[PDB]
Symmetry: C2
């Protein structure tokens, strides 16, 4: 009910939501993400989230994200994005850890918005 | 599936989008951080209040009629309407509204998604 309605906003928001597991594999994808990145839900699911990075940025972005999430509980930054068709853009990104039991991180939630024009 | 619902609901208080969930009578039943940033009110000040408190006095009846009308025809409503902030200033937002349903395939209210468009 209450939970159901909060979850429904998923495919209606403009923000691009990317849900990943501990292994960094995309497990959920919303319509906002389909618009921002180009990949359909069926295409993104199962793929490494780093697929969304400009290859050259992956190493430093990943260590920076892992550090913030584990120490501050949240990572935020302005990074480049690699679209499905190949063009590059800039996005405002946030990563929040998802917990299982006894505060055990079981995956992460990514929220993204395009800022290329700006 | 509960795992799916949980993770999807999780994004609720993290998106930039202002989500406003209302009942069949337009009273706020859920409000995320995004709405607090956009409208100025916190969850404690928004939940249980009439959603028209966010409209500029004059616009209410018109907006409500277009929403209902749009939902009955297309099952969704979208529009650029004025917004009345808690601190009293007025602005414009890009808004969308779709019906939410209970467990019996019956409408129990609405889901509103909003974004500031004031500048420009």
């Amino acid at each position: 009910d209450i939970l159901k309605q909060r979850a429904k906003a998923f495919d209606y928001v403009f923000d691009a939501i990317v849900v990943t597991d501990l292994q960094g594999f995309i497990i959920d994808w919303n319509k906002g993400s389909e618009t921002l990145y180009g990949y359909s839900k069926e295409q993104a699911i199962g793929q490494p989230v780093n697929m969304l990075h400009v290859p050259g940025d992956t190493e430093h972005i990943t260590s920076e994200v892992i550090s913030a999430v584990e120490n501050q509980g949240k990572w935020t930054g302005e990074i480049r994005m690699l679209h499905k068709d190949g063009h590059i853009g800039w996005i405002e990104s946030m990563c929040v850890p998802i917990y299982g039991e006894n505060y055990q991180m079981v995956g992460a939630l990514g929220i993204n918005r395009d800022i290329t024009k700006r």
